[PDB]
Every structure is written in structure tokens, then in C-alpha cells.
From Swiss-Prot, chains A, B, C, D, E:
Subunit composition and interactions: Homoheptameric.
Residues bearing attached sugar chains per UniProt: 70
Pfam families: Innexin (PF00876)
Keyword annotations of the record: Cell junction, Cell membrane, Endoplasmic reticulum, Gap junction, Glycoprotein, Ion channel, Ion transport, Membrane, Transmembrane, Transmembrane helix, Transport
Extracellular side stretches: 60-109, 233-263
Top-rank lineage group of the source organism: Eukaryota
PANTHER family associated with the record: PANNEXIN, PANNEXIN-3
Lineage: Eukaryota, Metazoa, Chordata, Craniata, Vertebrata
Protein name: Pannexin-3
Gene label: PANX3
Family: Belongs to the pannexin family.
BP term (GO), one: cell-cell signaling
The reaction(s) this protein catalyses: Ca(2+)(in) = Ca(2+)(out); ATP(in) = ATP(out)
Subcellular locations according to the entry: Cell membrane; Cell junction, Gap junction; Endoplasmic reticulum membrane
Length: 368, 368, 368, 368, 368
């Protein structure tokens, strides 16, 4: 089946024969909400198209005709197959030959919608995946040096505090460490500054979401203009004597052609509206995600040395490449190593009490 | 077949191409009862839908008509295919055209139910699996330090007891070990305290079960309102002359249309009730599981150093994140290492006799 | 299905059983735009051919006939199967027997176009892939020596600058390093010079794109000459008595033969025009890519020792082997090692400020 | 389908279950032109045979009959199936019963041609592959000793030249190295001499190409003798009363039998001529390849020590085993090791200037 | 299809699930000519059987009948299906009811021939493969000690010859080495002597070839006795009133039954003769192979120490186990190690000149 081929051609990853290396393994380049939206926006028209051609209706004929008994079997087949290509209600009300082309174009329209909704996925894959992957992995490699440089070369501070009055050393020793060369990273404050003034992935993300929104609007227009007119129309009167059959002796207006699969058309015309009105607010929520700064976990991020640079750059216009980098980092920061200490520092959510809270928590997180 | 595709699309794991690493191997993120409920609540409508389209009924036609002998083959096919889309019992009792739409909507309803029952699974997978996995693996890693720290640095207590009167040292030496820095973990008493005051996975678990309960109630309403009325109705009188065929000379009320697949409809309408009334009390049992504290094995848990913190936090409202963490831990605590010593300490189920019971059991569990 | 076989025979890689070694893994020998063009220009006629034979039209007959009622079933089948091979509108307007052969030749034409559009792919695979691969991997191996030779044997310059006035050493020490034997590569300035005067892959690239352009023009001519004439013609009058049936008593001009699949023909005739008018400007953009020198990143390339030779050779006719080598290098330079330092040196995009900018950035990029 | 089985039975490698070792991996025993010729000469008749039985014509009947209306359905089936086995145009012009057997024999002829064109492939596989593989791998193993013996034991010549006047040592030191025992190989000058006087693979190559040429000529004769006569003949008059039906009362000459699939026959008869007239000059080009000595790269080959023996043996009759060995070596010399230095020595294409050109190029090609 | 199952059940290896070890990998237990004969003698009847049931004839009926118009459809089906089981030409010439049973027995006969031709393969696999494999691998293991014992412990002879007059030492030193204990193998001269007097694999080989020859003769007898009589007979007159239908009123002699698939029968009857007259002389050539001693390469074999024993045993009756061992060794001697030195010693094909020829060739073949 065509849907079987499209199941693996689209709606999945089509890069390399897989099992290559770290290009795809261990890194998530698509947000779970984006993946769900892509799946339920691409496979849904494909699912409806498959349901149109499924075992629910065992083939049969999409059109039925009431031809006179004088007609043979082949003549009846001719007058019923010549109307599936000439869907025109020759109404007696001049001669408004209203067309019923959506009935024949439904599979074409569904396939066109399925192909169209895959364009934003291709745009994201071939316009933002490489640069975003490079930035994410470089930043992850740089931030992986924030454990053997934030405690293991900082545990000498424990030696300094424990000799003197520890509460006093908690507030008047830290300026020496904050001014140390190795304590502050030398490359992140420039890379992040450069990324702050560049608008490249923000444009791609906004285009990816706006294309889906515009395609949903186009689907609404298609189903409100062409459909919803021939929606309760099941019978139409045709005319076979509209050509070389004019000089003959048989039914001029072969009345009462019937659309056998009208119910499937009606069900699809509503399931293509409900499914996408489900997705209408999800896209705008995805757009809102980038437009709002997030500071719910800034308290613990600012404490750590390397993440202090990320926390400081929290001002200005929210539309920056750094925002997309942060959005794809927080979904990827917990790959295999930050899963044991960053996820632990969640107790601090309420700098006086915070001054002494690390009296026993920070050193207790040692790997051995 | 569509059921063949849905067999692997749903009703299984759809994350990664597998064989990746420790993300899924060795960790059980779904309780066996939850897995059974999900399987028998998702595949059951799919199984019934497949049985509707299976070899049991070799296609055929879902409707049969008794048309006059004057009608040709094509005319009879027209009058029998124009009634499967116009199921309306034009009864002579005014003109109550009772519809028989459930007969045509049964596959649609079954597919809709199958898709709806997969929503709680998606909610659990994309709203609680990451945080629960992180908490579970962190707690497991911390508790894995409860064997080389509860006997191997405690076997010096054997040296102390064996020199003096061992029964006396069984009760007056332990305060030194209980006050030792390394004996008591420094991070668990804070992580568990933080998790006690957080209600995040409790809400997700309750929502996951309540969605299934509400969907079962909706299925009951659907089968009690739309079904159970056209349940013993097998014959209905139609009307083809309800349109452009009005000005014709043939049967006005084409009486005695017959629903060929009424028996399948009746069997499905009962197997969709029995199967879900089997599942009605299982869901409430799953809800009860979280609402009741468990203390059947507290006697052996309190003896161990690390598990003493877990045993102490056994008071207050049962609805806490720690309850879900414990429920998913006791089903996962016995992965590969706790399978040889924790499962052995089951003899203690009856502190005077318990004082001397470990005279030979604790030290005999040494790995060499 | 034939399309199923052509899916794996073409439209993919057909060299070796794969999993061999570094022949294909880690090296990209086809640009993403070229890959997209090849896919959407080869599979599109195949997709339309599959749609012609898909479940959308459940086989049936491509021609229908209105034969007299005296004819038997076999006689009607004869007069309807003898016209699908004799498509000739015997119009009464002398005796212009206009042929409708495109209706029968549509699958043949689609298969011919699909096979023809694969010729440039074969030409690129068997005329430029080996030499381009050899040059690319040799240049990559030579350029991989530009990290342990541009800083690690250059960090002594740090020792020289830090002793004296560093700003002065920033401008009067570099002539010694620029005149050093090891600092300047001894093979690239000759290999690139040889490649500059050779036009071998430029001709292959231009031929590969021009063949696709010429085939698109041929498709336009085919659809504008043979099609677009029998486009709204659905009925034609045939003649069975044009031979040994002349001396018989039956319909001389068996009027009103009908093309059942005219709608599919019309849709294909438009989808084969829209899809390729989408591709018309992409090919000329690909041609433009080679014809224009690129200097958007020359500022950082000139700073590096090895890439200085590449940056210097930026004059003359753009049509040279070095241009194609650069085009396939910039898409392949970031394989696994240049992904951590070359992608970082993007801050320099605005030699006075550039003199002191590397005071801290260059040495901070050390691997440990 | 039969074509599906023949796709993997032929048109590919049928030796071992693969993944065995170096028997096939890393060695190319078939030239790309030979592979293309074999593919497009073996699969083309198979492709046409598949197209004859494809979805393009949905089975049906290959013959149609115009029997009188008195005949029943079974009688008409008898008189139409008794003519597909008795294709004889009983023309009224004595009684020249011209046969139309190519219409029935087309699939048989296509399968016979597909099997026949596989004979040269089997001949090459079972008559020249082992000896050629042995010679190629032995020569490759011997020539792999031309890098650690042409510079690394020759770099002492650098020590000799740099002490004295280097241009003088460029021309008066080399006689010592040319007379050294290890510098000149002791086995190649005898193995190549033995292969020069042996004509074993030349005969096999010539037979392999001439068999394909003769089979193409036979196909031309078949399509020009048996076809091209019944090419525009679509109707023939049969006779069922040519036996036990003679004493009956029905149509003596059942006129106007019709060949339903005449168009497919006509298209195949032309596509089997065009495809092979495409291949006619390719075979003679392959024959020309062996008949002409190649000296386009002799300048760099003569410089190398080991390849000097190959370059010297460039005289006499071109038809020798050494010619085939060289043809299969130049397509295989660049396997994994000669890909970094032999492909670089392309600058020398114009012995005075050549005397000093290696002043810096030869030593710069060192592996470290 | 049955042929699909027989493709993998037979015509290939059916021992173990493969990928086991050195039982099958690296060892060739079937000669290429024997493999070709087995393939083209077993699959050919299977190929013809598949062609009988292929898409070439779309099922249909193998028999057609000309029943009177009074007969219904079911009556005609009865009288045409009651003759495919009662093929008897009730000729009017007493009452010689000639049977046409080969038409019905053709698939049975083809399957029987395909099964019968597999008997020699089973006999070879289960009667000679184990002993031959053991003998071959033992002899190969013993002969693998003929390189580190024929030069590396013989290169001291170089030290002896180079000190004195080398031509003199070429002829008067060798008697010492020929009389040395280690130089002459102590097991081969007894194992080969034992195998010379044993006739076990010779009988199996002769039986394997003679069974195929006898089966070919039986096929010739079958096609010359039962076929070739009903070969141009296409029409026969049947009789349905030969039983309980005798007391009825309908056609007594239902004349003119027709064999619809006579052409397929005729083509198979000729392709089963040609394809086996091709194989008739190949089998006798295989028999001749064993019956003639081979001494074309004895000159180089006698020079080597270990192969001297093989070369000496070249007298007597050619029918011995040693002959089969040699035949399967020369096709297997060049597995992975003898591929670099035995295949090189081909220059000696013309003991005076041979005395001094090894002055340089023998020592030059050293592995380093």
C-alpha cells in the first residue's frame, strides 16, 4: 500500500542507515511537543487516506446509477463510469451544472496536505539541524568541565573555611575564587555574547511554526469553501447525451446518480477539522515558549560557576539564538553525566539561609 | 491490515530504535498491573475491530434488500447500496425515521476508543517518565552504597563484640555507630524530605487512572444510549423515492432491508461491556495502592542503615511523591545486585529475640 | 509492485552491501540540495506512475463503450478491447483520424522519464565520485595537521610575547614564524596550483545539471505538444468495421467511446508541470553556486596557517576544479574533529582590533 | 513473481553467504563499464518481461473473438481459447496459413535472451576470476613494498645530496642506487616476463565480449526475421472447423480474431532494439581498450622503482596477459594505501626540469 | 509457492544454521563443474514447473469443451471438468480409447524428476563428504609444514653453496638434505600408500555421476515413449454417457474437447530434452577427469619436498582414492597461504637449466 511506503519514507528519520555513531545517538534535536505535533499533523491525513481505502469499505463503486431496465450490463457500467468523471448536477433550476469534484479529489487533497505538512520538517532538518547541533555539542562539551572545576578544584575552599570560623569564610573568601583565572571560563562569555546578537535559529523556528499555522488555515479555507456545500448532497442528475450520444434514443437526463461513499466523505471532512482544531493552540503555545524568558530555576543555576554566565544573560529581547539554544539545552542537558548532580540540587527553591545551606550538601555529592 | 500497523505503532514501546544503552534496559518504568491494563484496554477494541473485518465473515455485504423481480442487477445493487448510507427505518407508526447509524459507525467508534485509551499512556510517557526515571536511578545509585557500608565497614563491630560479652555489646555499642558521620547518609534525608512535600507524580498517576475510568464510563454511556435500542432490530423499511426518484414507477417503501452483520454487532456490544467490567475494579485497586501505606516489611527495612530513612518517613498524608517513588522502587529494587541479600532477609517476621538473631546471619552473607 | 522494486534499485545507494569501511561512512559526496533535487526529480514520476496503478482507482477498465443491446457480453468486450489498441477519433469532419496515444503511453512515458532522470546520477557516480573522493580525503588528511601545528608548535610564540611587551610582539615577531619551514605546508601550494589549471569536475558538474535542465525542457515539450491537445477530449467515435469485419451487419461507427481514466491523466499532466517548474530555478541556483566566488568567511580562514593557501587562491576564472573541491569541502570540513574549534571562531566578522583579539581566545581553545 | 526470483538469482553476486573475508571485500574483479553492460544487458529483457506481466495491463485476455450471438459463454470461451493456441491467419488469398507465433513466444524469447546473456558472466566468473584474482593480489602485495623501499631506504640519498652540491648529486649518484640489490625487485621482472608470453585472460576477455556481440546480432536477426512481419497485423481470421468440428453447423471461418496486447508487443519490439543499439558500440569500445597501449601516466610511473618494470614492458603485441593485468590493476591499485601518495604525483605531466622538481616534493610526502 | 519453498529446501546447503566455524568456511567440498551440473539439473525441472504455473498463463482452464447450447453453465462445467479426469480420445476407428495422461501428469513428472535428481547430491553429502573432508584437512595441515621446512631450515644450504663454488654445490650437496630425518615427512608416505589401495570415494564419485546419467536416460525414455505420441494432438472426442448418464438424452460423444495448454506442454517437452542433451557430455567429461592422470605441473611439484611424495605416486590404475583426493586438493590447495608462493612458481615449464634457475628465485620468495 502507498500508506505503507509513506510510513517509513516520512514520519520518521531518513538520514543514514543508522548505527553510525554519535551523530544521532544520545542527542535530541527535536522537542517532544514538536515531535508529537509533526507526527499527528503528518500521519493524520495519511491515516484518513488509508481509512478511505481500508477494509471498512470493501472497494465496490464510489457511484451508483439508476439506469432503465432496457440497458445491458455493459451499458449500465458505461453510464455509471461516465458520471464518476463528469460529476455535474444538471439541476432543473440557467442550467447550473454544480460540480461535485471534492468527492473525486479527496484522496488527492489528503495526499497533498500530507506532503505539504512535511515541508516544515524538511526546513528544520536542512536549515537549522547542523548549526544547532554544532552549537549544542560545543556548549555541552564546554559545560562538561563544570564538575571537575567547581568542586574538585574548589574543595580547597573547604580546607580554608574549616580552619577559621566557617560562617565568616562563607562570605569573605569567595572574591578570591571569583577573580581566579581558571574559575571563570574564557570562551563562553564570548560565544554566548556572539549568539545573543545573531538571529538565525529564531527565524527558522518561527518559520517552521508559522508554516504549519498557515497550512492549517489553508485546510480550514479548503474545507469551508469547497466542502460544506456538497455535504448533505447525495443525489444528482447527470446527462450522458452531452456529446456524440445526443442523437440517440435513451434517457436524456439519467436522474438519480448516488454517491455511495458520502458517509466516508462526511466523516473525513469532520475528522480533518477536529484534529487540527486540537493542534491550533499547541502551535501558538510552542511560539509562546520562545517569547518568554524562564527564571524558575535561576537560583541554583547562578550558584554554579559555568551556568552563571548563562543566568546573567537573561535580559533584553527574548527573540535571540541564545533562547533557542537554551530551549534545546534544557531538554538535552541531562544526557548521561548531569543526571546525578544537577537533578539533585532541587532543594534550593525558597542570601542568608542560602549562605550556609551548602555546609554539607555540596561536598556530599562527591563521586566516590 | 490497519490492525497490523497499529500492533507495532501502539501497544508497545515507540522510543528509539532500541539497543541504545541503559535508558530502557534493566529498569522497569511500568508496573505489571499497569502494563496488563494498558494492553487489555488498548488492544481489545483493536481485536474486536479486527474480528469485524476478519475471515470469520468473508466480506460480503453488510446490508441485504428484497427488491422486486423487475429490478435488474445494477438497480438492485443501487437500492441496496443507497440504504447502507441512508439507514432510516421509515416506520408506518409521525413518520419516525429512526436511524441505525451505530451499525455503520461501529468500526469508527472502535478505532476512536482505541485511540482514546492510548492518551493516558502518552501522558505517563511524556509527563512522568523522565522525572520518575531520574529520581529512581539516583535513589538506586545512592542505595547501592548500602552493602559496602553496612557490613564491610561494620564488621569491626564484630571485632568489638567478640572480645567482650557479645550480648552486652549487642545493645551498648550501637550508639557510637549510629552517631558516626559515614554511617548515616548525608543526602537522602534531604532528597526524601523535599520529595515528601512535592505532589507531581501523584497527580500524574491519579490523572492516568482517572482518564481510563472516565473513558470506561463514556463507553458505558455510548453502549447504553446509542446501542441497546437497535439491538434486536434486524429489519427496517427504507425509501428510495425520497428525492429525484419521486417521479418514478417502482416500490415507494422498499420494505425489508436486512442487516446481515447484526450478530457481529450484538457480540461486539457485549464483549465491549464484559471486558471493561472486568477492568472497572482493577483501576480502583490501582488507585487504592497509592492511598494506603505499606508496612509489611518495615521490620527488616528499619534494621538496614540506608533504608532506615525510608522507613522513618512513614507518616502523614499517603498522597506524596515519595509514595510513588517507593511503589516504583519496590518493583525495581531487585535489579541485579539486591537480588542476593535483600531477598534473603525474610526470616525476620515475628527487640529481644531480634537482638541476637544476627549473631550468625549477618556475617554469613559475605560475598566471598 | 514495480515501483517497490524501483524504490530500492534507484533513489538510493547501490554500491556494495554496505558496512564495509570508510568508503562511504563519514564522507558526504552529494550536496543536500543535489540529493533533494535527485530525489524529487526521480521519485516524482515514479510516484505518479504508482498513483496511476494505486488503490485510488480499483483497476477497472481504462475505456468504456456504448454498444447496441444486440451485442453479447463477449462481443461488447471485443469492441471495447479493440478500441484501447486503436484509439482513433474517426471524426465526421477528410476523415481526420486523430490519435489519442498519450492515454495509452502515459505509464511508458513516466517510466522513460524516471529512467532518463537517473542518467545524471549515474554520470556523477561513475565519472566524478572517485577523483573527487580522492582529492577530498587527501586534502582533509593534509588539513588535519593544522591543529597540532598552528598552536601547539606555536604556543612558544606565547612564551616570546609574554616576556616582552605583548602588543609589540603581536606585530614584530610573526615574520619569523611565517618564514619557518614547518609552518608553511610544502605540498598544498602545489596540489592546489595543479588543481587550479585543471577543468575536470567542473565539466562533470555542469553536464550533470545541464542534463537535468534539458530533460525538464524535453518534458515541457512532450506535455505541450502531445498533451494539451487531447486534454478536454473525453469521447471519441471508433470504427470496428475497418478490416475483416467490413462485410458484417452491425454499427459501422461505434460512437461514444469514453476514456474512463481521463481525470487521472489530467491530474498527472498538471502535477508533472508544477513539480518541475518548482525545480527549474533550483538547478540554475546550483549552477550559480559554482560561478560565484565566496569570501564571507575569508577573515578567519586567512588567519589560520594551512587555510591561508586556500584563501590566497581566490582570483581568476571561478570555473576551476578548486571551486568544486571547496564546495564539497565546506560541506565536509566539519566531520568529527573540526567541529570543536573551526565552528567556534565565528566572533571575528567585523588589522588593529584583530591584532589583539587573540590575546585570550586562541590559547583558551586547548584540548585539555 | 519470477522476475523477483531472477532479481537475486542473477544480476548480482551468487558466491558464498558473504561476510567471509578478503575474498571479495576490498577487491574489484569487474570493471565499472563491464558491470554496467552486464546489468543493462541482463535485466533489460527481464524488465521488459516484467512489464509484459505488470499492472499496466491487468491480466485480461491476449486474444479477443467476434463469435455469433448464438454462441453461449462457454462456446465463446472455447472459440477464443482455441485460437490463442492455433494462431494461423487463414487468409483468402493457396490457403497461406501465416502463423503469428511471436505473439505467444515473446515471454519465452525474453527469458531465453535473459538466460543467454548471463553465459558470458558465468564464463568470466568460472574461467578467469580465480587466476586473475591470484595474479592481482600477488602483484599488489609485491607492489606494497614500493613505499618503505623507495624513500625510507632512499632518504640516505638525501644525506648524500645535501652534503655536496645537490644539483650534481641529482645526476651522478643514482647509478649506485640503480645497481643496488634491494632497490630492484628480484621476482617481478620474471613474473611479468612469464605473463607477457601467456595468452590466457586475453582469450577469455575477448570471448566474453564477442559472445555478447554475437548474442546482440542474434537478437537483431530474431527481431528482423520473425518480428517486423507481424508488426502492424492486428486482425486474423481463424478456423475452428479444422478437425472433429468439421461436421457441424456454425461459422466455418470465425473471422476477426484480434490480438489485444499488440501494443505491448510493438513497444517491446522497439525497446529491445534501441536498448541494444545503445550497447553495440560500448562492447567494441571495451574491445578497443585492450588493443591499445596506454602511456598517459608513464612519466610518473617510470620514476618509481617498482613501477619501472611495469613501464619498461610497454612494447610488442598489445594482446597479452600483462595488458589485462594492468587494466584490472589501474582500477584496483588505489585500494586503501596507494590513495595518499600515488594520486598526489600528478603535477609531473610536462629530464632537466624533472631533475630538480623532486627537491622538496618527494621528501614532503612522509607519513609522519 | 511450492517452487519458492523448494528454492531454499533444495538447490543449496541444508546443514546447520551456518556461521558455526571452519566446518564449511574456507573449504570447498564440491567442484565448480559439479555445482553447476547439480544446479542446472535440479532447478531446471523446478523452473519449468514454475513456468507452467507462472503468470504467463493466468490460470484459466487446461481443457475446453464445445457443449450444446441447451446445456446450462453448471452442466457445461460438469462436462468440461469430467473430461480433465477422463482424458480418453474415443476415436471412431475397436474403440481405441487412447489416453492423454501426460497432459495431467506433467507437473507430477517434473516434481518427480526434480526430487530424483537430488538423490546423487544426498548420496555425496551423506556418504563421502565426512571422509573426504577429514582426509583433505589432514593432508592440508600436513602440507602447511612445507614452507617453514623447505626454505627456512633449508636456507643453510645457501650458506654452504655461497662459500664454495655455487654451481658445484648445486649438484653435490643435496644428498645430505635428501637423507635428513626432518626433510622427508614420516606420515605422508604411509597415509598416501594406504589411500592408494583403498577404493571408497572413487565408487561414490562414479555412482554419483552414473546415477545422473541413468536418470537422464530415464527422462529420455519417458519423453520418447509417453510423449512424442500425444504431441500434435490437440482435439479429442470424449464420452460423458459412460456410466449412470447412459440413460439420458444428450450428446453421446461430446466431440471436440481441446487441450488449452498444449503449447506449454510442447515447449516443456523440448526444453527438457535440450537442457539435458547439453548436460549429457558434461557428465562423461567429469567421469573422464578421474580416469586420466595429470602431470602438467609435475615439474614444479617434484622440486618441493612434501609434494615429491605426491608426485612419485603417479603410476598404476588411475581409479584410486588418491586420485579423488588430488582432484579435491588442487581445487582447494590455494585457500589462504599457498596463494602467494605456489601460484608464483609457474616460470618453470620447459635438469641442467633447472639446476641454476633457483639461484635467485627461491630465496627471493621470503615472507619479510
Amino acid at each position: 500500500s502507498l500508506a505503507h511506503t509513506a510510513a517509513e519514507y516520512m514520519l520518521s528519520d531518513a538520514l543514514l542507515p543508522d548505527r553510525r555513531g554519535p551523530r544521532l545517538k544520545g542527542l535530541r534535536l527535536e522537542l517532544p511537543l514538536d515531535r508529537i505535533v509533526k507526527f499527528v499533523a503528518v500521519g493524520s491525513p495519511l491515516l484518513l487516506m488509508s481509512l478511505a481505502f481500508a477494509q471498512e469499505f470493501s472497494s465496490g463503486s464510489p457511484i451508483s446509477c439508476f439506469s432503465p431496465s432496457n440497458f445491458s450490463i455493459r451499458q449500465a457500467a458505461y453510464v455509471d463510469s461516465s458520471c464518476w468523471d463528469s460529476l455535474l448536477h444538471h439541476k432543473q433550476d440557467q442550467d447550473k451544472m454544480k460540480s461535485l469534484w471534492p468527492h473525486k479529489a479527496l484522496p488527492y487533497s489528503l495526499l497533498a496536505l500530507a506532503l505539504l505538512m512535511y515541508l516544515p520538517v524538511l526546513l528544520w532538518q536542512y536549515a537549522a539541524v547542523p548549526a544547532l547541533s554544532s552549537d549544542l555539542l560545543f556548549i555541552i562539551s564546554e559545560l562538561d568541565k563544570s564538575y571537575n572545576r567547581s568542586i574538585r578544584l574548589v574543595q580547597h575552599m573547604l580546607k580554608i573555611r574549616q580552619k577559621s570560623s566557617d560562617p565568616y569564610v562563607f562570605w569573605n573568601e569567595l572574591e578570591k575564587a571569583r577573580k581566579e583565572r581558571y574559575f571563570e571560563f574564557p570562551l563562553l562569555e564570548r560565544y554566548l555574547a556572539c549568539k545573543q546578537r545573531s538571529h538565525s535559529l529564531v527565524a527558522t523556528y518561527l518559520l517552521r511554526n508559522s508554516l504549519l499555522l498557515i497550512f492549517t488555515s489553508a485546510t480550514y479555507l479548503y474545507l469551508g469553501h469547497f466542502h460544506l456545500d456538497v455535504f448533505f448532497q447525495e443525489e444528482f442528475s447527470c446527462s450522458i447525451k452531452t456529446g456524440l450520444l445526443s442523437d440517440e434514443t435513451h434517457v436524456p437526463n439519467l436522474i438519480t446518480c448516488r454517491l455511495t461513499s458520502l458517509s466516508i466523505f462526511q466523516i473525513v471532512s469532520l475528522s480533518s477539522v477536529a484534529i487540527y482544531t486540537i493542534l491550533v493552540p499547541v502551535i501558538i503555545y510552542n511560539l509562546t515558549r520562545l517569547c518568554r524568558w524562564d527564571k524558575r530555576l535561576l537560583s541554583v543555576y547562578e550558584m554554579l560557576p559555568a551556568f552563571d554566565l548563562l543566568s546573567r544573560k537573561m535580559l533584553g529581547c527574548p527573540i535571540n539564538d541564545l533562547n533557542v539554544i537554551l530551549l534545546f539545552l534544557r531538554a538535552n542537558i541531562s544526557e548521561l553525566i548531569s543526571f546525578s548532580w544537577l537533578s539533585v540540587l532541587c532543594v534550593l527553591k525558597d542570601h542568608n539561609i542560602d549562605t550556609v545551606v551548602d555546609f554539607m550538601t555540596l561536598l556530599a555529592g562527591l563521586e566516590p
